[PDB]
């Protein structure tokens, strides 16, 4: 996260870290057994880390649980990132408490101008590299589809939306991928891609979760 703030320990209790020897992506807990992330975060050997603040220090509220299966969206395209969504099942159910909590799925898509909370352990620099160890947060509005498409002509599908600031300086970035965009209590987005980070006229692009609720509900019930 570039241009954000330190969230505070366990203040985003649905945020997970995906670990394969090291943090490589975020995700969101949607019930005690299941995590939503980006399809571009797919790999073998995932351990889900819940209850995290400092990802380099054991602080006492963590749960570490291996994935038992991963399901990438049937129509995911790894070039364009259309349908950039994946479900991860936990080998054992998480123990839900005030520091390890699920986030609700959308009941519809959200309006442009609505404010959202974007979070992660990704790079905090728009030029160069610095990785925080504590969770970072950013408040950012959903942008209109027209301003999203004008920034990214020929690239945006109905399964994507932009959020952030056209002036630059405030955005998600590398290592935030797969993490949450929460607006009015609903998981409306997944950190997906952008052109660089925090650049002028290059806002963040997010998977439009509202289009996937039926697929999520049916997939988890049959797995
Ligand atoms: N792993 C992995 O293999 N894939 C990852 C690499 C990292 N990544 C990025 O998007 C990076 C950093 C990033 C991450 C998250 C959020 C932001 C943000 N600014 N909010 C920025 N930007 S990139 O270097 O420009 C880049 C690098 C590679 C591909 C693209 C890409 C993908 C699809 C469509 C398009 C298109 N142009 N239409 C462009 C773009 C997400 C995909
Ligand atoms: Ca920790």
UniProtKB/Swiss-Prot annotation:
Coiled-coil regions listed in the entry: none
Gene, per the UniProt record: PRSS1
Tissue-by-tissue expression: Synthesized in the acinar cells of the pancreas.
Protein name as annotated: Serine protease 1
Compartments it resides in: Secreted, Extracellular space
One record GO biological process: proteolysis
PROSITE patterns associated with the record: TRYPSIN_DOM, TRYPSIN_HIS, TRYPSIN_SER
Post-translational modification: Subsequent cleavage after Lys-125 leads to alpha-trypsin. Further cleavage after Lys-170 yields pseudotrypsin. A cleavage may also occur after Arg-99.
Assembly description: Interacts with SERPINA1.
Catalytic activity: Preferential cleavage: Arg-|-Xaa, Lys-|-Xaa
Gene Ontology CC: extracellular space; serine protease inhibitor complex
Annotated GO MF terms: endopeptidase activity; metal ion binding; serine-type endopeptidase activity; serpin family protein binding
Keywords, ordered alphabetically: Calcium, Digestion, Disulfide bond, Hydrolase, Metal-binding, Protease, Secreted, Serine protease, Signal, Zymogen
Similarity-based family: Belongs to the peptidase S1 family.
Organism: Bos taurus
Cofactor note: Binds 1 Ca(2+) ion per subunit.
